[PDB]
């Protein structure tokens with residue numbers, strides 16, 4: 001139960017150390033965009049990030065204390081939300097653009113290359129705009145990302161000791177909550193402002209969930225149309241949502 | 245023990 005005995009500062013340190021690297025896309029500027037190639041680039045990248053994400057998850061305090069089957073469920077539920085919040089964060093400093101990778105920066109018109117995608121882009125762009133308005137800090141972002149991992153899936157658990165097991169997840173979520181407040185208190189926010197920013201931050205997660213739900217149906221539509229061949233991990237990740 | 249994700253979580 002080491003995760004429940006961390007100070008806020010140690011919690012923050014642990015999450016910062018855990019952060020995965022920023023990967024490059026296989027984008028070739030000498031290749032003219034098509035629906036297939038764009039979806040090819042995005043899925044290839046996402047497929048490479050999933051591996052790093054799995055390794056990041058193991059470093060989130062509390063996560064390794066769960067059973068393997070719990071760990072699988074949380075990740076199956078959250079993976080696209082986690083990709084999206086990382087994207088939105090990377091993009092905060094590039095208005096009107098999404099920084100999928102440092103060599104792959106797309107605007108909304110380039111999203112129109114893929115059927116149904118531009119509406120997802122617009123929401124992702126809107127979320128980064130909100131992050132920029134709020135002046136979201138890196139220490140707040142790594143708390144939010146971990147909250148997404150632990151929260152998405154915590155209530156859809158199929159079930160024993162399930163109850164007792166979930167109790168541990170809620171204790172960690174509470175620790176992350178304390179850590180956020182700690183951060184905000186340290187930055188000089190009054191009590192009132194602390195509760196207000198905490199709520200604003202957590203209310204963004206609702207939108208991130210909605211975007212993930214929409215993105216998931218879009219990905220599934222791409223698979224069905226055979227637009228791009230999807231990797232076996234990404235397929236498994238997608239199929240876990242049991243769409244149509 | 246058959247899912248790819250399960251395998252990668254085990255390493």
Ligand SMILES: C[C@]12CC[C@@H]3c4ccc(O)cc4CC[C@H]3[C@@H]1C[C@@H](O)[C@@H]2O
Pocket residue numbers: 042043045046049083084086087100117120214215216218219222
């Ligand atoms: C799933 C997705 C391709 C991969 C994208 C993707 C790829 C890498 C990454 O780091 C983040 C994202 C977030 C957006 C993802 C797209 C949303 C859908 O409209 C589309 O099918």
Ligand SMILES: [Cl-]
Pocket residue numbers: 023024048
């Ligand atoms: Cl890579």
Ligand SMILES: [Cl-]
Pocket residue numbers: 034035036
């Ligand atoms: Cl085309």
Ligand SMILES: [Cl-]
Pocket residue numbers: none
């Ligand atoms: Cl338009």
Ligand SMILES: [Cl-]
Pocket residue numbers: 189190191192
């Ligand atoms: Cl005060």
